[PDB]
Amino acid sequence: MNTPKEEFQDWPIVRIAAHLPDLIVYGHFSPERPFMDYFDGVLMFVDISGFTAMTEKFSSAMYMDRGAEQLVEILNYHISAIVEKVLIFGGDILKFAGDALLALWRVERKQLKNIITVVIKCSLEIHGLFETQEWEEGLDIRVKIGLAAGHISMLVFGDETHSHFLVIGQAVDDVRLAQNMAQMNDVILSPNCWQLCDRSMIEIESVPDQRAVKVNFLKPPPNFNFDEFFTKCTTFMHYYPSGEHKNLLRLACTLKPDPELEMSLQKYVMESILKQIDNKQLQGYLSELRPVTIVFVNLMFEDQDKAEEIGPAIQDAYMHITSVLKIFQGQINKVFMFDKGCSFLCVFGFPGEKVPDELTHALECAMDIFDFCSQVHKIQTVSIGVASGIVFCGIVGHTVRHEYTVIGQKVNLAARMMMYYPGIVTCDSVTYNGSNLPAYFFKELPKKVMKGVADSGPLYQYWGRTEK
Ligand SMILES: Cc1n[nH]cc1-c1ccc(F)cc1
Ligand SMILES: [Cl-]
């Protein structure tokens, strides 16, 4: 009797699972919104820092109308190799944001020390991928890595149709601080990561005026064998592909159809992505250089450390944000923590979602979100940056682990505006000029020097309809 091999694994549920971490795929949590959960882990924040001198160059006549296609191809080539490294070393990629990603090794406290060693080896191996690498004949392309460790809270919020999750807490804020101390080729350890790590393994140098450390070397003891040590470490990794599935990058590739699980997983994924997953849209339709308006919403909390307070506040803000965005077919593309503030990357004019007067509407939506969230219990400050122009849209990452993302100078500008101009709604010159709304709706702002942005152009506050 024949025994044909190679099981089917290309189900819709498996395609949806590529867009999600194991944290969600295998999460099995309660129906309530918000849901909060508490654990320990190691975080890795990887930034690709060459990928700016190419995005706006991919929008040039050089690329002959295939700018977005060439951009996503070369980015995915490089990001895919980082993803395979994280997955093989047992990490869970939480989220992609442009040419950057956050990964998690979740583990019980007693295993943090050994898991840190695994995450350090992974990090140096990621740097090794880029040792003699270039984008074009002249531009290097290297990464910066921040590592943090300790207590981590997960927040899941949303409504009956949409879900979003966030990691929160001091380790999360730590990994961002560690990452932006990093220079090209660095691995920076947060102060608590350094306090928790196996110091007999790792040669460090001090970071001036910082308690965070830079890794110089991983110098193993005489009888140390990384492969055997890694094997011992997989004992504590719930979902590490093993045995029969030792050849897979993710246990999620083995997901079987399950209507209840699929209903729950699809809530995290945009409808245009689901349409492609269902073979009802061309697989390449979402890769594009596209004019859009970014509405970047930051919420700062009265107690920035009180996870139990911030959960309901984010839930309340989200409930109103989603209802305002729906009206103009605007989308939440990402949510993440930024200076212990909750940030919503909102996008107007996505594929099949472009509607006229996009600019007037992004501004009125921003103000609507601003007025409501300002009155949300425990929200201390609302800040909104609005910028409009050509941005890259596309699915970024590896075949087994990828997310739809936006990349471009206007994305970074809206993010810098909400941080540098807190407590107000700001917009760039494109939005101001193209709103045609009368000038007295705006206030022209002092020019601030903003990290990463070279000549923002004139910036404005959206003052609104009245003097009050
Ligand atoms: C999210 C995201 N997707 N693409 C770019 C970003 C980003 C995130 C934070 C930030 F400060 C500036 C840009
Ligand atoms: Cl997050």
Curated annotation (Swiss-Prot):
Hydrogencarbonate binds at residues 95, 167, 176, 337. Mg(2+) 2 binds at residues 47-48, 99. Detected in airway epithelial cells and testis (at protein level). Weakly expressed in multiple tissues. Expressed in brain, heart, kidney, liver, lung, pancreas, peripheral blood leukocytes, placenta, skeletal muscle, stomach, thymus, airway epithelial cells, duodenum, jejunum and ileum. Very low level of expression in bone. ATP binds at residues 47-52, 99, 144, 406, 412-416. It is found in: Cell membrane; Cytoplasm, Cytoskeleton; Cytoplasm, Perinuclear region; Nucleus. Mg(2+) 1 binds at residues 47, 99. Cleavage may occur to generate the active 48 kDa form. Residues 42-179, 293-418 form the Guanylate cyclase domain. The N-terminal guanylate cyclase domains are required for enzyme activity. Fragments or isoforms containing the first 470 amino acid residues are fully active. It is linked to Hypercalciuria absorptive 2: A common type of hypercalciuria, a condition characterized by excessive urinary calcium excretion. Absorptive hypercalciuria is due to gastrointestinal hyperabsorption of calcium and is a frequent cause of calcium oxalate nephrolithiasis. Belongs to the adenylyl cyclase class-4/guanylyl cyclase family. Catalyzes the formation of the signaling molecule cAMP. May function as sensor that mediates responses to changes in cellular bicarbonate and CO(2) levels. Has a critical role in mammalian spermatogenesis by producing the cAMP which regulates cAMP-responsive nuclear factors indispensable for sperm maturation in the epididymis. Induces capacitation, the maturational process that sperm undergo prior to fertilization. Involved in ciliary beat regulation. This is Adenylate cyclase type 10. It comes from Homo sapiens. The lineage of its organism: Eukaryota, Metazoa, Chordata, Craniata, Vertebrata. The chain holds residues 1 to 468 of 1610 of the full protein.
